[PDB]
Amino acid sequence: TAPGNEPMAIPSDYKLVWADEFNTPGAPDAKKWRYDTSRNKEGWYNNELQYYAAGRPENVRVENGNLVIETRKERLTSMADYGGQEYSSGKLFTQGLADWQYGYVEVRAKLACGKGMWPAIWMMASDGSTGWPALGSIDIMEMVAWDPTTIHGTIHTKAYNTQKGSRTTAADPCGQFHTYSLDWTKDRMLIGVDGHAYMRFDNDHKGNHDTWPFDSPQYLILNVAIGGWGVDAAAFPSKMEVDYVRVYQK
Numbered sequence: 001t002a003p004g005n006e007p008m009a010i011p012s013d014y015k016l017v018w019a020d021e022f023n024t025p026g027a028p029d030a031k032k033w034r035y036d037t038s039r040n041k042e043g044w045y046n047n048e049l050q051y052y053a054a055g056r057p058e059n060v061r062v063e064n065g066n067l068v069i070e071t072r073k074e075r076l077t078s079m080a081d082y083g084g085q086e087y088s089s090g091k092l093f094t095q096g097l098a099d100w101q102y103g104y105v106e107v108r109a110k111l112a113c114g115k116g117m118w119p120a121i122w123m124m125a126s127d128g129s130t131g132w133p134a135l136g137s138i139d140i141m142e143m144v145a146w147d148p149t150t151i152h153g154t155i156h157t158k159a160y161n162t163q164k165g166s167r168t169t170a171a172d173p174c175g176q177f178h179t180y181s182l183d184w185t186k187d188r189m190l191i192g193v194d195g196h197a198y199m200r201f202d203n204d205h206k207g208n209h210d211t212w213p214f215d216s217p218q219y220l221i222l223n224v225a226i227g228g229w230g231v232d233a234a235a236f237p238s239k240m241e242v243d244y245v246r247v248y249q250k
């Protein structure tokens, strides 16, 4: 419903303004990522089945130049925020550490596969005041591992949820790295894989928050949900590998 078909590349007049190359093995860098544990006791949205474990290397660890977000079948019943979940996973975001208004975002990633796995790379507005989905949301990459070659790119607004999205295919996305990218300006968003936009969403320039809520900063989110849109017990453990995040601006 938001088709695109054009090349995408880091413009020559843009600079790298922030990156996690994941050069440093161990815990993610607390200056760049926080853990989101906020709905662990209550259960996450979308009828999701995962517990998101914070400072737990079995779920979130930097290893051989990659962020590793790993889902496991275990019950983390010793955690004070445990919510009876049958699976653990990771969710990191830049919320309250780094956000961006416009930019070329590049995430190079090998995905987490298995029926139930729902790896994502997505953004939400730092200003949450208008609520969901009015605040505006950008899914650079969504995949559901019962359809594991298909890459989804979508935006969420008050007027559109009407959802504006598109899809493409990539070669063994869980067994090789691709670059999932967003090119966001005041005029439009492209979302692509490997230098090709398969998704285009234009600003109608009508100054209407319901249709263009993207004249304000967004933060970035990395996670593997389990269930919802994504359960094969044999598929665990499974992991998303992020080689780098790079953000460029004029």
Ligand SMILES: OC[C@H]1O[C@@H](O[C@H]2[C@H](O)[C@@H](O)[C@H](O[C@@H]3[C@@H](O)[C@@H](O)O[C@H](CO)[C@H]3O)O[C@@H]2CO)[C@H](O)[C@@H](O)[C@@H]1O
Binding pocket: 045, 046, 118, 119, 120, 122, 131, 132, 137, 138, 139, 142, 156, 225
């Ligand atoms: O249900 C009302 C609550 O919504 C919270 O927002 C959630 C929303 O409910 C949920 O459907 C949604 O899920 C995401 C998809 O929209 C898409 O962006 O891809 C994501 C990654 O796969 C997926 O998680 O996420 C929203 C944000 O957590 C509100 O935050 C809450 O205030 C409200 O009561």
Ligand SMILES: [Ca+2]
Binding pocket: 021, 022, 023, 065, 066, 242, 243, 244
């Ligand atoms: Ca790296």
